Each structure stands twice: as structure tokens, then as C-alpha cells.
Design a protein around this ligand. Structure first.
Ligand code: HEM
Length: 154
């Protein structure tokens, strides 16, 4: 759905994410919670984590962020051919954690913010646009799968 060059921009900056997945995952979750604190209500085990320091010191939080970014990394590496990887995640999101699509918009914003804050030399305008399209496609395809399951995502 993207150009091949756009996918290389997405996977180039993703290679920089992979140099430190746990750190990126902490930054991305903490950014999400800062910008949209209503998202923290979905994480029953992280409600007692009151400061950014406490969140960064939580191996639980750190593990969740690695799982979530590993899943996204696997999907991004498919270059759009991700229906097999996306269905189980849609099933989990839709019928277990109950994540509205807007929350995936929020965490997509967090991802764009953290990656540009850490790798501006690897994440200019063209690369942000590529990743934005990639995350858009992830979100749209997952929302289709939500409907398929009988949840509309809001
Ligand atoms: C790029 C977007 C996201 C990806 C790829 C992702 C992926 C994952 C994966 C793979 C898991 C563990 C497996 C599973 O539960 O099926 C997980 C767990 C979870 N996700 Fe995410 N997720 C994303 C965004 C979000 C958002 C925005 C929220 C809520 C605001 C959320 C809430 C949760 C919760 C509560 C869990 C359970 C954590 C635990 O193990 O205790 N996720 N996510």
C-alpha cells in the first residue's frame, strides 16, 4: 500500500528502535499516559505507578512495551502483508483488552513523537509520513477485523 522506498524509511527507523526496544517501549507507554491519561485505565497493574520514575523502574511496564513493540515490528516487517499477524491481535484487542481505535491513534502519536525525539536524523518529514501511513494501515486493517468480530471500536 506504501511505496517500497516508504517501507525502507519505516524499516530504517525501526532498525534504530531495535537497538533499544525496552527503552523505546517505556518512552512510548509513558508518553501515551502523559498525553492521554485515560489510556492508563486499561492497565490495571500500572495504576499505582504515579511518577515517570516509577514507570521507568517497572519491569512489568517494560515487559509490556517490548511485547507490544515486538508485535508491531513483526507487522511492520510484513510490508502490508500482515493479515495473519493482525487477526490474533485484533481478537485480543477487541474481545479482551477492549481498546478503541482512538487509543491506537493515541499510541501511534506516541510512537511518532518518541521516534522523532530519539532519531531526528533518521526520521525527517518523509520518514514520519511513511510511518504515519504504515500506522494508518495497521489501524484501518485492525478496525476491519474488529467489525468482523462484532465490535466497532469506540
Ligand atoms: C501499536 C499498538 C499496540 C500493539 C502492537 C499492542 C500489542 C500488544 C500485545 C502483543 C499484547 C500482549 C498479547 C495480548 O494481550 O494479546 C498487549 C497487551 C496489552 N495491551 Fe497492547 N498493543 C498496542 C496498544 C495498546 C493500547 C493503546 C492499549 C491501552 C491503552 C493497550 C493495552 C494493553 C493491555 C492492557 C495489555 C495487557 C497487558 C498485560 O500483559 O498485563 N495496548 N498489547
Amino acid at each position: 500500500v506504501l511505496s517500497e522506498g516508504e517501507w525502507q524509511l519505516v524499516l530504517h527507523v525501526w532498525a534504530k528502535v531495535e537497538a533499544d526496544v525496552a527503552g523505546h517501549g517505556q518512552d512510548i507507554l509513558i508518553r501515551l499516559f502523559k498525553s492521554h491519561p485515560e489510556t492508563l485505565e486499561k492497565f490495571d497493574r500500572f495504576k499505582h505507578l504515579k511518577t515517570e520514575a516509577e514507570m521507568k523502574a517497572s519491569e512489568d511496564l517494560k515487559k509490556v512495551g517490548v511485547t507490544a513493540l515486538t508485535a508491531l515490528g513483526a507487522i511492520l516487517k510484513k510490508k502490508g502483508h500482515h493479515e495473519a499477524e493482525l487477526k490474533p491481535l485484533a481478537q485480543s484487542x477487541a474481545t479482551k483488552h477492549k481498546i478503541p481505535i482512538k487509543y491506537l491513534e493515541f499510541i501511534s502519536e506516541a510512537i511518532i513523537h518518541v521516534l522523532h525525539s530519539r532519531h531526528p536524523g533518521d526520521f525527517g518529514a518523509d520518514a514520519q509520513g511513511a510511518m504515519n501511513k504504515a500506522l494508518e494501515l495497521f489501524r484501518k486493517d485492525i478496525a476491519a477485523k474488529y467489525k468482523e468480530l462484532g465490535y466497532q471500536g469506540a
